[PDB]
Design an enzyme around this catalytic site. Structure first.
Site, PDB file in Angstrom:
ATOM      1  N   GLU C  52       0.837  -1.214   0.096  1.00 47.35           N
ATOM      2  CA  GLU C  52      -0.134   0.151   0.088  1.00 47.35           C
ATOM      3  C   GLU C  52       0.850   1.365  -0.054  1.00 47.35           C
ATOM      4  OE1 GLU C  52      -2.560  -0.852   3.817  1.00 47.35           O
ATOM      5  OE2 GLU C  52      -3.547  -2.332   2.248  1.00 47.35           O
ATOM      6  N   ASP C  61     -10.715   8.146  -3.829  1.00 51.56           N
ATOM      7  CA  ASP C  61     -10.357   6.730  -4.197  1.00 51.56           C
ATOM      8  C   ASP C  61     -11.108   6.610  -5.565  1.00 51.56           C
ATOM      9  OD1 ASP C  61     -12.830   5.949  -3.753  1.00 51.56           O
ATOM     10  OD2 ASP C  61     -12.096   4.647  -2.036  1.00 51.56           O
TER      11      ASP C  61
END
Lengths: 187, 190, 188, 189
Positions: C52, C61
């Protein structure tokens, strides 16, 4: 079917079983037969033959009311008293119950596995010599070793009893140990 | 953990019930199944790490020995720290956890009474600071193996001395370290 | 562990023998005296963080949801992330540890067999990536709950797919991730 | 009961001490482990004796079963009473005390609140007469296990019925017996 038992044991151990743990489990599975390892009715026959059957309650040498094959208290805990009567079949069942202390002792004190015929003969011996004598015994040393030889030979060593304050060979004990040793040696 | 499925399975093999001897036999094997040795937790590594300087570049300590992280001298694969080596904080935590195994093994062997994880972690922190011989000879361990857990806790506080030149003395910060480890050891919950 | 002094003392208190119900009661309380505590390890968190990106200020997002840190959309205090938010890496790691608690619970719950800490870690990584629903129905979990740990390890590699325009296909990187998780699961 | 070895063994398991919650769950196990264990008292046996004549020679009851003493049909050793049997008053008291042991057990198992000895004795007298099943399903027992002792006492009086010509009817002999048992249950001082 021991798969559920073995899987439950895997949980306890972390998921897998070591080889040593499998061996310890296998010893426990033998004790997990219903009501645990017990004297057989043939082993009771082995023991009864050395004693007298009394169908009427009577007072033994030290005053205790006794019936059957030396029974002084019934399976439900109640003491034998004057006027009690029993059949052969009842006397066998009472004796089986009186042997349970010694069944338990053999199971606990013997750590190696045993055939039913070995177990029955050992219960006969221990009934006759006591738990302490058996526990401290050179026989139990040699048996806890899978040595079914030095143990089976140690049967014949226990043919002494008290006469006029000392131990001496008792012919009836010599016969009984020979029959027990032969039972312990069956195939 | 609860051994219920184990006893349920045994019960069915034994025809619906277990005798007292069968229960005792199952308890012996439970003793032999349940894993008995334990490691220091990550919260235990944090308890120790707290007081240590982190170095991400290898350096020579006072006796010339190349060191990195939190006092690491040898990597887990057994290779000695050398000039030019570099590490992250995460690697340094991992190296010190391996460094600590010496003392984890000693607390496992030397302590003979059951320990909570928080108790075990605090003992490893103490043994790391005082070494195995001092721990094994301690009154702490004597009170602990005698099940005097609170007496053992108090003994944490006597280990507040360190060497300066030719003698030992109570150190600035060692009392506070022992206090924090004692507090960790005596946690009642979580 | 040693339960014999506990059972000896219980037997004597009970009058010299224990009933089946009393034995079960004793086993239940021992589990309360020595309960299992299972959490993701520091290396397990690292295993997941590996994959990540750290974001020190909130962004949207791909579906429009404001996100910060290592993928956090709600803070430990329950507040949703929103535009303008900023965070330090230490905060980001703290948020992500809280994010994984739901999955620590779920792995502990759906898996009914014991797990080594490394096995546990790798499973939390997998379930965080594929979700509980896929995990629940997985061949992986059925083999695992059968104590077929070796079988369950090889099932990691089938989870390298995702949805593109409405059906499954292999996603670049997911093969490498499943391979790394399997290795992790299988350490000694 | 000495629960100290049990607590000390539990402490050992738990790392040397018990939390308050662990003490609470250990106390619940103690409750399950210790038998209620009360026995009927000698005065309780006298309470139950008084309702029956002493018979020193075995006789056939109203359904043909050989009986002796105070209603005994099977001796403590399990042997049925037979024709020709004889007994003393002391033996008949003994046989009664063994006959009551099933119902002593049942009262101990079914009642989950503390009981004075006199309360327990009177309950055993009732349960011996009405049987374990009727007592288990009674309002008396539900009021009793709710700590409503006075209400349970009053419930003795509703058990004065028995079969007459195939149906239940009040029987004065049972009314008088329930009155005496209630009076016994309510004793104090």
């Amino acid at each position: 079917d021991v798969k559920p038992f073995f899987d439950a044991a895997r949980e306890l151990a972390g998921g897998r079983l070591t080889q040593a743990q499998v061996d310890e489990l296998n010893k426990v599975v033998n004790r997990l037969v219903p009501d645990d390892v017990d004297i057989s009715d043939l082993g009771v026959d082995l023991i009864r033959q050395f004693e007298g059957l009394r169908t009427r309650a009577y007072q033994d040498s030290v005053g205790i009311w006794t019936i059957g094959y030396g029974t002084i208290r019934y399976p439900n805990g109640v003491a034998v008293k004057a006027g009690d009567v029993c059949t052969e079949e009842q006397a066998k069942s009472y004796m089986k119950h009186d042997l349970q202390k010694f069944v338990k002792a053999v199971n606990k004190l013997v750590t190696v596995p045993l055939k039913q015929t070995q177990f029955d003969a050992l219960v006969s011996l221990v009934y006759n010599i006591g738990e302490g004598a058996f526990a401290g015994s050179t026989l139990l040393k040699k048996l806890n070793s899978k040595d079914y030889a030095g143990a089976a030979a140690q049967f014949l060593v226990w043919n002494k009893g008290r006469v006029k304050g000392k131990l001496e060979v008792i012919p009836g004990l010599t016969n009984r140990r020979k029959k027990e040793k032969a039972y312990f040696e069956q195939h």
